[PDB]
Design a protein around this ligand. Structure first.
Ligand SMILES: C[C@@H]1C[C@H]2O[C@@H]2/C=C\C=C\C(=O)Cc2c(Cl)c(O)cc(O)c2C(=O)O1
Ligand SMILES: C[C@@H]1C[C@H]2O[C@@H]2/C=C\C=C\C(=O)Cc2c(Cl)c(O)cc(O)c2C(=O)O1
Ligand SMILES: [Mg+2]
Lengths: 214, 212
């Protein structure tokens, strides 16, 4: 029952730029996704001021990073406001954010890719480190959905009948490129996170899997 | 489409015994579940010698322990052979396995619970530390199912949990006085003490907040 959609041209152009012309500072993808998560948590907190029942779906407010070495996947989960189906379709492909063209012009003018969040399209920096991505999201009073794309021209949005229940919020699953597997290692993730985590108000949890020795 | 079934008498009788018992070595539940996991992995490993395609669904052979503190749940996952819908219905409630009665009679006579695995029903020692349990399982060429009981149980097509690929995951809803088994140090102690001779990696998933 999976809708298929095409990326709007400006977003396809933006991903083209990012994938093909940005050679350094690829680690900023994690700052950008942590920022999106923090914003999403801000939003549910705001709603909770007028209606504290909105937090009941998932009471703890967190940002969680989960390296999955077996699958060569890096997951980033938050318990923020989450997204409906229409939210996923519009925020992540069909509507070009106002800043998309502006950001492409800024890159051409000499901007560092680190600036991408100032233009509201920080999501797309993940394609610096991944060719395939799933976005799982759960909004109050709606079902859980999965958005998926392979850094191409189309994406799908489907009712989620295969992933763990989020309760509320969003989880990105980054299928990392073969030369970008450094981001599955605890020490590298901590290094990158500590650079820009001094003013994040929420706990950033790192899930590490280690074999029991002895 | 969730089939609901009643526990067979001898199994319901057994769980009552275990759940109510006063034991001091309740930590043996983890040895029993790790042993079940190791057995399931042996079986898919052997089958894969004649048909290596059987591992493609989940190429890694592992035992994975995942404390979920927010939910007060301890998960134990393996990539073994898994169970069909019929396997779940029969193995875990409707058919009393040979040795169910024998172990209950031994327990009533005073035997230590540590003996349960020799009767092949070590699964039910999880009720030493949990009141509710879900068993998620995926066998090759069948769908993923969830068995659940908190004196009836249900088996349902799994459309809510992470895909296992292949194998089995127990989700133990721990009693309020048994939450020590969510702590990294306690689990490592129990694993090193009683599961030292397992042929597969036993992985512990630990969540730690980053110092911002
Ligand atoms: C619409 C909601 C709430 C918005 O406040 C967040 C700010 C920017 C979000 C941009 C998005 O594209 C969706 C999104 C992404 Cl990409 C992410 O990594 C994490 C998230 O939690 C959300 C989200 O759930 O977004
Ligand atoms: C039927 C298969 C293969 C069997 O060889 C294992 C030996 C005993 C298993 C007993 C069971 O009740 C099912 C089971 C349990 Cl309880 C468990 O904790 C972990 C598992 O991986 C399996 C399983 O998938 O078992
Ligand atoms: Mg072994």
């Amino acid at each position: 029952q999976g809708e298929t959609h095409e990326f709007t041209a400006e977003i396809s152009q933006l991903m083209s730029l990012i994938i093909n012309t940005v050679y350094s500072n690829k680690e900023i993808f994690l700052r950008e996704l942590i920022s999106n998560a923090s914003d999403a948590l801000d939003k549910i907190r705001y709603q909770a001021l007028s209606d504290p029942s909105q937090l009941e779906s998932e009471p703890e407010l967190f940002i969680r990073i989960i390296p999955q070495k077996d699958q060569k996947v890096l997951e980033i989960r938050d318990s923020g406001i989450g997204m409906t189906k229409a939210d996923l379709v519009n925020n992540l492909g069909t509507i070009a954010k106002s800043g998309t063209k502006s950001f492409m012009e800024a890159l051409s003018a000499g901007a560092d890719v680190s600036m991408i969040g100032q233009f509201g399209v920080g999501f797309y920096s993940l394609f610096l480190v991944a060719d395939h991505v799933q976005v799982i999201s759960k909004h109050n009073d709606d079902e859980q959905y999965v958005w998926e794309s392979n850094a191409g021209g189309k994406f799908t949005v489907t009712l989620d009948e295969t992933n763990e229940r989020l309760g509320r919020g969003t989880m990105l699953r980054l299928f990392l490129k073969e030369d970008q597997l450094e981001y599955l290692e605890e020490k590298r993730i901590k290094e990158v996170v500590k650079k820009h985590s001094e003013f994040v108000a929420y706990p950033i949890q790192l899930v590490v899997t280690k074999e029991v020795e002895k």
